[PDB]
């Protein structure tokens, strides 16, 4: 919820960037019903970090949608 140098909590983090990169832009509460509903709380944490780095951004309230950044894909892509 905050333990963000885990273990556990760096494979939330790339399976939320595997699903953002390899599937599409998503809410969070799609993004729990694919990695795990009962980690809801660590991919909220996950991506509010994520966020406040500039890697993902939201898009919208109800709900936001959650999407990689140009910062982020520019070290994934090639332009
Ligand atoms: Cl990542
Ligand atoms: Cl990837
Ligand atoms: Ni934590």
């Not at 960037?17 to 599409?24: A, E, H, K, P, R």
């Not at 309230?61 to 140009?70: A, E, K, S, V």
Request: glycine share 6%; aromatic share 6%; charged share 30%.
């Amino acid at each position: 919820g905050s333990h963000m140098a885990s273990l556990d909590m760096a494979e939330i983090k790339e399976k939320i960037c595997d699903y953002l990169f390899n599937v599409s832009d998503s809410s969070a509460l799609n993004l729990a019903k694919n990695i795990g509903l009962t980690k809801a709380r660590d991919i909220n944490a996950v991506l509010i970090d994520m966020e406040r780095q500039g890697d993902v951004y939201r898009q919208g309230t109800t709900p936001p949608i959650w999407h990689l950044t140009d910062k982020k894909r520019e070290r994934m892509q090639i332009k």
